[PDB]
Amino acid sequence: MMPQWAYMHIAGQDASEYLSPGLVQFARATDTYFSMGNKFRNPTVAPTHDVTTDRSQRLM
Amino acid sequence: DGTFYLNHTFKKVSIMFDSSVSWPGNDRLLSPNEFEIKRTVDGEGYNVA
Amino acid sequence: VKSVTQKKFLCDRTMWRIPFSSNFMSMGALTDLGQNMLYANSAHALDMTFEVDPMDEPTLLYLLFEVFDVVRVHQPHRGVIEAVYLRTPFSA
Amino acid sequence: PQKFFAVKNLLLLPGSYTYEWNFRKDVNMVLQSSLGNDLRTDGATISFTSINLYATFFPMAHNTASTLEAMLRNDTNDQSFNDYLSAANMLYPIPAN
Structure with missing residues (x-):
């Protein structure tokens, strides 16, 4: 569950958080000519709290 | 190649x-049990449409 | 002359999609039910039944089980590559 | 081009590697026709003479490059990639009629 997801960034820290500060500074400085955005994965999660009623009711 | 036609x-x-x-059940559709x-x-x- | 109406539709170069979310909306890559407790640790066997218009030639039902297919590539020293793969679920 | 999801965007570091791949010679796979006829029985032929690999380098300054490899060989700076389709493919037969 959680450990493997954090390992491959399925659900966890965003791109800049886990990368080294030197790396993010270098990426910011050189993004004009040498981009490295694709190289690192950004996790995207959906909210699982008080969004959809779990009871029984009709959509339409 | 992704050219689906059926x-x-x-x-x-x-x-x-x-x-x-x-x-999904929970009576979420007009036909609740199938699509x-x-x-x-x-x-x-x-x-529709 | 007297007539009867016929209706149909065409939808090419596209895939029918049934998302695994409570409200069928793509709020995020990791769906809400993807991290649901019952589907977190319990084991379930899934049964599907399709209905199609019969045709006089053999056909194949393409099914895509949406998963996470990720790889982590490491190069610690010179000339060394190590890749760690993880498919979730339906793991290799 | 290269299409594998793991190595189509990887930033390769200094060192010596072995790069290998296979190519098809079946005409019914590498060629497309508007009629869909069997090209194997209709005399299509394809033959490869020489295959080469081209690679271009950013002429980055040597100091900044060295800093880049130094910073990119740590455990927290591991490049991660995912396949766009991100689905397990299953094929099921439907018999005729």
């Missing part, structure tokens, strides 16, 4: 979990 040939889709419960993609010959009132 999507309209489907009639309905039924999902069962653990062979007992239905997805009626298209409904020909019929037409009691559940067609």
Whole structure:
């Protein structure tokens, strides 16, 4: 569950958080000519709290 | 290559979990237990477009 | 002359999609039910039944089970590559 | 081009590697026709003479490059990639009629 997801960034820290500060500074400085955005994965999660009623009711 | 051309040939889709419960169930659809993609010959009132 | 109406639809170069979310909306890559407790640790066997218009030639039902297919590539020293793969679920 | 999801965007570091791949010679796979006829029985032929690999380098300054490899060989700076389709493919037969 959680450990493997954090390992491959399925659900966890965003791109800049886990990368080294030197790396993010270098990426910011050189993004004009040498981009490295694709190289690192950004996790995207959906909210699982008080969004959809779990009871029984009709959509339409 | 992704050039699919036979999507309209489907009639309905039924999902069962653990062979007992239905997805999504919870009476979330007009036909709660299946997914009626298209409904020909019929037409009691559940067609669009 | 007297007439009867016919209706149908065409939808090419596209895939029918049934998302695994409570409200069928793509709020995020990791769906809400993807991290649901019952589907977190319990084991379930899934049954599907399709209905199609019969045709006089053999056909194949393409099914895509949406998963996470990720790889982590490591190069610690010179000339060394190590890749760690993870497919979730339906793991290799 | 290269299409594998793991190595189509990887930033390769200094060192010596072995790069290998296979190519098809079946005409019914590498060629497309508007009629869909069997090209194997209709005399299509394809033959490869020489295959080469081209690679271009950013002429980055040597100091900044060295800093880049130094910073990119740590455990927290591991490049991660995912396949766009991100689905397990299953094929099921439908018999005729």
